[PDB]
Design a protein around this nucleic acid. Structure first.
Lengths: 67, 72, 158, 53, 141, 107
RNA sequence: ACGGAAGGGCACCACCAGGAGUGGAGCCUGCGGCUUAAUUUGACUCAACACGGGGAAACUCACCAGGUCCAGACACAAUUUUGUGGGUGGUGGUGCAUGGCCGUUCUUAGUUGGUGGAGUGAUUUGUCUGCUUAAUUGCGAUAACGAACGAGACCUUAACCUACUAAAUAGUGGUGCUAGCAUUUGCUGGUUAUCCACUUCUUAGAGGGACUAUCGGUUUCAAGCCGAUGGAAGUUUGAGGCAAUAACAGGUCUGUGAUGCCCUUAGACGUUCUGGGCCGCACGCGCGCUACACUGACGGAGCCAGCGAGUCUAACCUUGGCCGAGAGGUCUUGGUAAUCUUGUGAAACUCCGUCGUGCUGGGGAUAGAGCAUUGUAAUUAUUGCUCUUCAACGAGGAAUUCCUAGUAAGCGCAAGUCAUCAGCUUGCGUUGAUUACGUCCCUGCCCUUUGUACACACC
């Protein structure tokens, strides 16, 4: 239920590889930047990638990723 | 009165059936309304409905306060 | 009388529903796709497009005598508003229903098991449809029941 | 030539039969339709189609 | 032509006029009180927004409203919480600061739908579906 | 007065696109050919009062069904046009089905 | 596939935990039987028996009353007139001379190629040793690589914008004076193109919220648990919808002239017609309730929910007035209605004076006299009303259904079926509360291993 999927990762790894100096910690700066970096055609995907950007800044402040 | 008999309605059973709400009597309601109209307390007002006459208005404001101040 | 406030404005569906089922269960050999109606202001004109324009023209009157008079005798319009003239129109064969008519013809003309098959896949390829999926119930042999199927190109299901 | 083939038919289930296919259902006089249940499915585009819920 | 605006203001589920009548603690509007109700059910429920907070606490505030809208159950279940918020929060200009801080800290462990104002608004639904909890109504065949 | 401006609210209401484009193209080309003020229309959340004659008696089985839905595309015009041309829009392009609420309110 | 073998994981159509019950006076439902000319038919497991609108008063009523009745085109003995092969007479008929639509496998996740190889083939890797759940969901390595579907693929949800140069029915200051007190201006008609503008509730289109984050341990953080819980949302965003993979001698041949099918038109394979049974009960099964109380009552505020039709050639027609013990009976008012029956108003709740628990007040599937409605039609009571003794159970055994926020459960209304005939389904309301957070013990369901002499696959 509270588990993650590869559908967010296949965009996440690409966007960080493209835009390393982006991804500021704040939620709106993450969201209103990612929605125009990556075209999204779903409001539920918009809300879900908002939540996933929260997960992403949690993982960034956790620190180095294994891969 | 169309709502008065409704508000005074009650539950009735159709034998082996549930209880249904049914309206009250209309005859006695009309008769008491006409009786008080003739007495001159209630009065038929324009635009559909009844208002209170001046005897009832006097019974409303001052003597009500006097009676409750007496019995309290 | 025949006027109501917000009842017939919603119950009008039955009319064009009957129209559509009639066009499907009778107007099949012409290849009825859809009525590209265009009601221009100051000139009410109701046209029809066909994939068999030669057939809907025909011998000048055998279809027209019904087609021009039945759409007028029913509701009693004035003349000169439901007009029936067919012209050469483009992109007639760029639709799933067009592929459906094409495979209907390829099934009805009566080819063998492989000839109609490579014919239809070459036709959908040359039309540019990169995938198809079709199922046929019933049978070809005389047995209980069969359901053949083939799908080229993978589709979301459903 | 028959005299006794008439019969009173003005109202009730004996007067009005179906018009769809001599069907066996559809006791609904909505807008004078009296159309069957399989017939409501034979009807194509009167449901108001759209799917989100 | 003339810039004449009606002073439209918001309430829980209705409109209001933004011109308050100040007074000397008179909880009425000039021809009728509201608070004398005597319901025989919700007595302690209406005493809760006031009796636990401070008995009178009306030496510097009045309610001056006339609105037609919303509903009666919404009115009874909203106006008392509304003046509770008015007397605990809007009184920060007037009431003692440590007193209101103690009150908010006391109510942080009390927010159990007793100090919540009714923010309900009427909404229409669409034709085509009726179910809420049970199933829908469909035929076989 | 002479050449009155009472501004009966013309209530653009259609069902199909053949009539919707017809009336909208009509009013805008009328404005274009007799040089009306340049203020165009936009659509609306349509005024749907829920009424229908449903024929789904009893709830057995599962749902293999559609949705009963329809959009009466009632739109409007934000402009300042005369009551004269507001009336002539109703006079010309005669098709029964277009309603006009008698409302003396311009804006 | 199976296992009465093993392990792992889930389900209040499984429960150490209980609450609301059926099986008790009882019926609405079909069975088999007596059946009268018929009491018409389909189907027999968690997957029919309140299902097939199937809650049937004269053709869907199929059965008789039977004098029914000659009413086809085409060689004929001199109204084809008895007889011909058959125009249809299939409206006599099977899911088995046909599809189509729904249900079962879908209270639980699994599905497919192309390469790479192994199996000198069947097949296997890809599709997983463990580690967490609503999931093939994440870590992680590997003959693996990179791709779609079930969820992910979408939108309606629930307590949403000082928001939309959007409409006179839902309304507010100034108010047009006060008719309730008329000096203690909120209001009564918003003085019938009516004190103006508009939405701030009737009509909802956009973008926008909540994410385990700011804390620490419980996996090495790579999963995941807590409490400060942060509200248009800490249960993924509660409730709802895609019949994904491929099968069922499954309900529909009696469904639309749908299938190489047996036979006819004068005694029509009966088209129609005078009507009525289609509810008859010696029997049991099944969902639905009227009570087995001082909980039966007067008086009152208790009323805070969208729900649905309308002559256009026949029945919707009054909110109010008037008569009546009451079914009910007549008028400005309702045929183009957000507009008039509709300004939809859903119901018993606390109370005290008094009778008052009992087979008596607890009531009426029981029997009788009169008052009238919808329907030609109220017969084998269609239905409500005034009265009359209550038989009925002292909370019903064996066995069996539902149950964790708008918490099941007691209660009454709106709509469909309706000319008249609710105990049949959905939505609301009054109180809105449990006895549970673990289980595989019964019941079943998925993954791995293992044996099989089964593979129309443990009937």
């Amino acid at each position: 239920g509270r588990v993650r999927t590869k559908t967010v990762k296949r965009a996440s790894k690409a966007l960080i590889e493209r835009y390393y100096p982006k991804l500021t910690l704040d939620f709106q700066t993450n969201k209103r930047l990612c929605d125009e970096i990556a075209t999204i055609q779903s409001k539920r995907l918009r809300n879900k990638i908002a939540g996933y950007t929260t997960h992403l800044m949690k993982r960034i402040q956790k620190g180095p990723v294994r891969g | 009165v169309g709502k008065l008999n409704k508000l005074y309605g009650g539950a009735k059973s159709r034998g082996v059936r549930p209880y249904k709400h049914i309206d009250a009597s209309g005859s006695i309601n009309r008769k008491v309304l006409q009786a008080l109209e003739k007495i001159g307390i209630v009065e038929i007002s324009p635009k559909g409905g009844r208002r209170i006459s001046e005897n009832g208005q006097r019974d409303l404001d001052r003597i009500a306060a006097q009676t409750l101040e007496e019995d309290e | 009388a025949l006027i109501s406030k917000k009842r017939k404005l919603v119950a009008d569906g039955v009319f064009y529903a009957e129209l559509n089922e009639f066009f499907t269960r009778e107007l099949a050999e012409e290849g009825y796709s859809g009525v590209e109606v265009r009601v221009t202001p100051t000139k009410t004109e109701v046209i029809i497009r066909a994939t068999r324009t030669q057939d809907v023209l025909g011998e000048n009157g055998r279809r027209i005598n019904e087609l021009t008079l039945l759409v007028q005798k029913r509701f009693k319009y004035a003349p000169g508003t439901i007009v029936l003239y067919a012209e050469r129109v483009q992109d007639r064969g760029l639709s799933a229903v067009a592929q459906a008519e094409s495979m209907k013809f390829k099934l009805l003309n009566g080819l063998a098991i492989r000839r109609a098959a490579y014919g239809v896949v070459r036709y959908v390829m040359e039309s540019g449809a990169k995938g198809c999926e079709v199922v046929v119930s019933g049978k070809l042999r005389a047995a209980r029941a069969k359901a053949m199927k083939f799908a080229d190109g993978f589709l979301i299901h459903s | 030539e028959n005299v006794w083939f008439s019969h009173p038919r003005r109202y009730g289930k004996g007067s009005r039969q179906c018009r769809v296919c001599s069907s066996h259902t559809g006791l609904i006089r909505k807008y004078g339709l009296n159309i069957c249940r399989q017939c409501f499915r034979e009807k194509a585009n009167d449901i108001g189609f759209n799917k989100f819920r | 032509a003339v810039p004449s605006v009606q002073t439209f203001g918001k309430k829980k589920s209705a409109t209001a006029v933004a011109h308050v009548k100040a007074g000397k603690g008179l909880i009425k509007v000039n021809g009728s009180p509201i608070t004398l109700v005597e319901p025989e059910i919700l007595r302690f429920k209406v005493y809760e927004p006031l009796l636990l907070v401070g008995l009178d606490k009306f030496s510097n505030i009045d309610i001056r409203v006339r609105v037609t809208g919303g509903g009666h159950v919404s009115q009874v279940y909203a106006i008392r919480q509304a003046i509770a918020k008015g007397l605990v929060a809007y009184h920060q200009k007037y009431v003692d600061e440590q007193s209101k801080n103690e009150l908010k800290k006391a109510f942080t462990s009390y927010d159990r739908t007793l100090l919540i104002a009714d923010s309900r608004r009427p909404e229409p639904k669409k034709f085509g579906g009726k179910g809420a909890r049970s199933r829908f109504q469909k035929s076989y065949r | 007065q002479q050449q009155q401006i009472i501004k009966i609210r013309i209530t653009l209401t259609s069902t199909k696109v053949k009539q919707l484009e017809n009336v909208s193209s009509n009013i805008v080309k009328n404005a274009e050919q007799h040089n009306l003020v340049k203020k165009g229309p936009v659509r609306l959340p349509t005024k749907v009062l829920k009424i229908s004659t449903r024929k789904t008696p009893n709830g057995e089985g599962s749902k293999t069904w559609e949705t009963y839905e329809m959009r009466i595309h009632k739109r409007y015009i934000d402009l300042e046009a005369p009551v004269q041309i507001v009336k002539r829009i109703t006079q010309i392009t005669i098709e029964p089905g277009v309603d006009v609420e008698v409302v003396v309110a311009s804006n």
